[PDB]
């Protein structure tokens, strides 16, 4: 059995959050060594190109593949859509604001003047 934890911190740079998300997505993927070997026995030495070494024009993908990336796109898009968790419209406390822009400005002022 296995165990780990990862706590959230400051967004410090957009890079940090991006990196966390990449970690998760990367861990998810599971590759088929079948297709890997199939692709391998055709091309051989072309498999291991340096930045500058080797070249074959284009690798054309079966559509079924393309569907995988499209699906992952939609998933990540949703997960990103949920970035900001909204606090429910609570009327219970005292109202001094005149509109929602004013309500939010009063909230930002509450953070900076204690």
């Amino acid at each position: 059995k296995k165990k780990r934890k990862n706590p959230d911190l400051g967004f410090s740079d957009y890079a940090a959050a991006q990196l966390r998300q990449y970690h998760r997505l990367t861990k998810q993927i599971k590759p088929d060594m079948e297709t890997y070997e199939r692709l391998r026995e055709k091309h051989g030495e072309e498999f291991f190109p340096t930045s500058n070494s080797l070249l074959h024009g284009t690798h054309v993908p079966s559509t079924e593949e393309i569907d995988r990336m499209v699906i992952d796109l939609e998933k990540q898009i949703e997960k990103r859509d949920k970035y900001s968790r909204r606090r429910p419209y609570n009327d219970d406390a005292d109202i001094d604001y005149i509109n929602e822009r004013n309500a939010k400005f009063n909230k930002k002022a509450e953070r900076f003047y204690g």
Partner: protein, 42 residues
């Protein structure tokens, strides 16, 4: 590096309500006054 917002006492461009407290926030006396005043009483 966070920048507080300004609430001015002159400009309220959008007409926003701010509580008196946050609206608000954004003496010496020498010791020779005693010697002068008491010298005068005497």
């Amino acid at each position: 590096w966070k920048i507080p917002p300004c609430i001015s006492n002159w400009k309220n461009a959008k007409g926003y309500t701010i509580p008196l407290d946050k609206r608000l926030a954004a003496v010496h006396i020498n010791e020779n006054f005693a010697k002068l005043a008491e010298a005068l009483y005497i």
